Amino acid sequence: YTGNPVICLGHHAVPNGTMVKTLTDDQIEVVTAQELVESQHLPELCPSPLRLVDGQTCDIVNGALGSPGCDHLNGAEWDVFIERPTAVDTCYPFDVPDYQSLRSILANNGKFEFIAEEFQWNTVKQNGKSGACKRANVNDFFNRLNWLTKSDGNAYPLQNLTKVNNGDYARLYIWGVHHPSTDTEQTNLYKNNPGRVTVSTQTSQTSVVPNIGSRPWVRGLSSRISFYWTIVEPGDLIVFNTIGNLIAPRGHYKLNSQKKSTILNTAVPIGSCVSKCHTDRGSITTTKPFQNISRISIGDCPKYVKQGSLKLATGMRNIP
């Protein structure tokens, strides 16, 4: 010690630290670090604070058409529509040209608010039903659609109907075209053999000719329906002009003016937790800025990155 006092300046250390990356070293030891990549998720979707609607056995598209298993979605509103991969078709076999667009519009709009309108179809029979679309245990049809066919007197006159949008909101009309499997089914149902469906607004007109031919048997039938949609802005109007094969709307869906909702397709059950970040693998509750759980994230979420781990140093070099 010699007898001159000594003062030493120093710094703390721990037995074993955390290794971090820097610009100059791949792995160097520091006293404390913090992980910036969330890797853990809950095995549930959390029903708060975002409003989750479970489609159960119904697609969003089948929910809009009003297929048999879908009555629980009448009037629903969501921030996130939870669509199940086990959903199945329960009604008339159909397709949708540009299917992903109808699905995106429906999911984004965020509600099923249907406004019934009485359409003054003339002569044709209405309310056609099908063995491919049982409700309870009885032949039925899509709830939002009205299958028109020729009268008992073998007439299908030109139909020419108008509905004016003089309200506050944009309207979504969903309509279809029936494709028979043979020429004789075409005349059996609609009398006129080339059917014709034209649906137009001031500025737009979608027009469709049915395709006749045998498709694979699905739920009793080899015929098909193709579904279309038309948006009618306030001040605009819609005209339905057909001489056969129209599957008529029964009204229209209301479109929100601000579209902020979406859809998630997952098998994950809805539980009881709280979280505003959802993935197809479940919700995540985290303050970390990044996550390697999924590409598919909805809400207030960390950014998806490739790395499994990024440790931020929160202390000095550890030299024990």
Partner 1 sequence: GLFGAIAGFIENGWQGLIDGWYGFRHQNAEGTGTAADLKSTQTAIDQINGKLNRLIEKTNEKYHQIEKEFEQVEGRIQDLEKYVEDTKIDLWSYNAELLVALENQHTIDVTDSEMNKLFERVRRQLRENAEDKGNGCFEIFHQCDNNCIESIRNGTYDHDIYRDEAINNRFQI
Ligand X SMILES: *[C@@H]1O[C@H](CO)[C@@H](O[C@@H]2O[C@H](CO)[C@@H](O[C@@H]3O[C@H](CO[C@H]4O[C@H](CO)[C@@H](O)[C@H](O)[C@@H]4O)[C@@H](O)[C@H](O[C@H]4O[C@H](CO)[C@@H](O)[C@H](O)[C@@H]4O[C@H]4O[C@H](CO)[C@@H](O)[C@H](O)[C@@H]4O)[C@@H]3O)[C@H](O)[C@H]2NC(C)=O)[C@H](O)[C@H]1NC(C)=O
Residues at the site binding ligand X, with contacts judged by CB under 6 A: 160, 162, 214, 216-217, 222, 237, 239
Residue whose C-beta lies closest to ligand NAG:
308
Nearest to 64 by CA among 5, 2, 106: 106
Q: Is 85 in the site for its own copies (CB under 8 A)?
A: no
Partners of 161 in the beta sheet?
Answer: 240
Q: Is 312 in the site for its own copies (CB under 8 A)?
A: no
Q: Are 38 and 64 in contact (CB under 8 A)?
A: no
31-50 binders of ligand NAG (CB under 6 A): 39
Q: Is 184 in the site for its own copies (CB under 8 A)?
A: no
For residues 101 and 207, which CB has a smaller minimum distance to its own copies in the complex? 207
CA distances from 255 to 41, 92, 113, 115 (A): 34, 26, 8, 11
First to last CA, the chain: 24
Q: Which of 202, 267, 269, 303 binds its own copies (CB under 8 A)?
A: 202
CA 124 from chain centre, in angstroms, equals 34
Query: What does the block give as tokens for 53?
Result: 């609607």
Count residues near its own copies (CB under 8 A). 26
Q: Is 204 in the site for ligand NAG (CB under 6 A)?
A: no
H helices of 42-145, where?
Answer: 60-65, 99-109
Nearest to 173 by CA among 242, 255, 95: 255
Q: Which of 56, 57, 108, 198 binds partner 1 (CB under 8 A)?
A: 108
To ligand X, the closest distance from the beta carbon of 74 in angstroms equals 30
**Gap between the Cα atoms of 82 and 67, Å rounded:** 17
Q: Is 313 in the site for partner 1 (CB under 8 A)?
A: yes
For 11-14, the CB contacts below 8 A with 24+ separation are 11/316, 13/318, 13/319, 13/320, 14/318, 14/320
For residues 239 and 273, which CB has a smaller minimum distance to ligand X in the complex? 239
155-214 binders of partner 1 (CB under 8 A): 170
Q: Are 170 and 255 in contact (CB under 8 A)?
A: yes
271-300 binders of ligand NAG (CB under 6 A): 292
For residues 101 and 214, which CB has a smaller minimum distance to partner 1 in the complex? 101
For residues 101 and 202, which CB has a smaller minimum distance to ligand X in the complex? 202
Which residue ranges make up the site for ligand NAG (CB under 6 A)? 39, 292, 308-309
